[PDB]
Homo-oligomer: A and B are copies of this chain.
Amino acid sequence: TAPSALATAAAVRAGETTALAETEAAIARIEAANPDLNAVVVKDYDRARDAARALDARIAEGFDAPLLGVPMTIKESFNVAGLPTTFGVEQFRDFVAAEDAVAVQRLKAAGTIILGKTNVPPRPARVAGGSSGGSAVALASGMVPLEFGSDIGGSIRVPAAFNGVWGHKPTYGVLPTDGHFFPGTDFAKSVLSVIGPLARDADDLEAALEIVADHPLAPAKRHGDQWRILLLVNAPKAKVQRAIRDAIDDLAERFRAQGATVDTASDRLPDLERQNAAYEQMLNIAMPPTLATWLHLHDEQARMQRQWRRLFETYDVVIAPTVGMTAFPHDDTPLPHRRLDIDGEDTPFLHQFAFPGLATLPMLPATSVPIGRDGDGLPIGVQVIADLYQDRTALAAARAAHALAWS
């Protein structure tokens, strides 16, 4: 199995391996596996190896970093100095970003080596399933331990679940957006939108999160000695495959055996019909609107976040599907027309966006964690949603869930 990001930093710190060797080993991994899946749009190998060599010169002086010598890739929407952020447009190939995104600077100051950027698909047979799909595919291949992505409609969480890897969708506004060009956005720095880490294990996710964040994040906390969890499988006008509903039910039983309380229903449940409507409208503005319309959407978003805050007075986390289905076949149908099949039932594809909206509209943190595999073998991933700014609580609960599911 491929080593984790923090394991790589420990070895380079130990001197067992060197940053150049780890970086070179990564490009060997990318060149071997990449022709077949086309995960990385841009390759920056030669500056990366000179960046690596400079780092080992600094390990010689005793310089130490939390992610020291970790080879890494990022979604193309991030700005890397000297490289284009084409977004699949030829005209934009002409231009190069002058300076790194803030997230990139913090990661390289943490000791990461940015080998390249990863393809962003529009919102082998199976789909990557998202804009960050190249990111999930890159870590699923084992090319790189660590990666970063963006989420507006589940682009962090859904690709991670489809490829059986971890992703974290942070609380809004804690990870700096600047230097990241949000895909499909009517307005730059579009609301509801976040950047987030992708990894193969929970510890790497948390490490990247704390490095890039503008301010410290409180550690995992629970109301009581045991986890108190609410399942949210039923969303308005949204249908879930039976295999996912079953995987969530088994995880709930294992949590109950260990002593957690796992509620299926709560009266304090927020009004999801009212929540989903606003998300659909805000998404249209995000993907001529009156000032008053825009202001009222913020009122709805403020009052939805208050309802989730009240629910989280009782619950530590909410567990929900990332999306109703496992990875689904390529489809070129226009999205309003787009029909999806859930357990032999054709359904509107639009309706599935309710699941990413659960976290995104209230601004809550959500961790996407693999808990199972489907009958055809597609990975099953779910989101662990926590209160505002309780990202580390969500990661802790996702960590527990993963130990239980794979036990």
* Smallest CB gap from A172: residue in B: B173
Tally A residues with Cβ within 8 Å of B. Answer: 24
Task: Judge whether A21 is part of the interface by a CB distance below 8 angstroms.
Answer: no
Task: Judge whether A329 is part of the interface by a CB distance below 8 angstroms.
Answer: no
Task: Judge whether A215 is part of the interface by a CB distance below 8 angstroms.
Answer: yes
**Interface of chain A: mostly helix, strand, loop or mixed:** loop
Instruction: Give which listed residue, B187, B216, B295, B306, contacts A217 with CB less than 8 A.
Output: B216
Task: Judge whether A203 is part of the interface by a CB distance below 8 angstroms.
Answer: no
| Number of chain copies forming the complex | 2
Task: Judge whether A290 is part of the interface by a CB distance below 8 angstroms.
Answer: yes
Residues of A260-303 contacting chain B, CB below 8 A:
288-291, 294-295, 298-299, 302
* Smallest CB gap from A173: residue in B: B173
Task: Judge whether A388 is part of the interface by a CB distance below 8 angstroms.
Answer: yes
Query: Which residues from B are CB-within-8-Å of A299?
Result: 187-188
- Assembled-state Cα–Cα distance A178/B305 (Å): 11
Query: Which residues from B are CB-within-8-Å of A289?
Result: 291
- Assembled-state Cα–Cα distance A320/B298 (Å): 34
User: In the complex, are the beta carbons of A302 and B218 less than 8 A apart?
Assistant: no
Task: Judge whether A50 is part of the interface by a CB distance below 8 angstroms.
Answer: no
Chain A interface (Cβ within 8 Å of chain B)?
Answer: 173-174, 178, 186-189, 214-218, 288-291, 294-295, 298-299, 302, 306, 388-389
Jot down 7 A-B pairs with beta carbons below 8 A, ordered by A. Answer: A178-B306, A186-B295, A187-B295, A214-B389, A216-B216, A216-B217, A290-B291
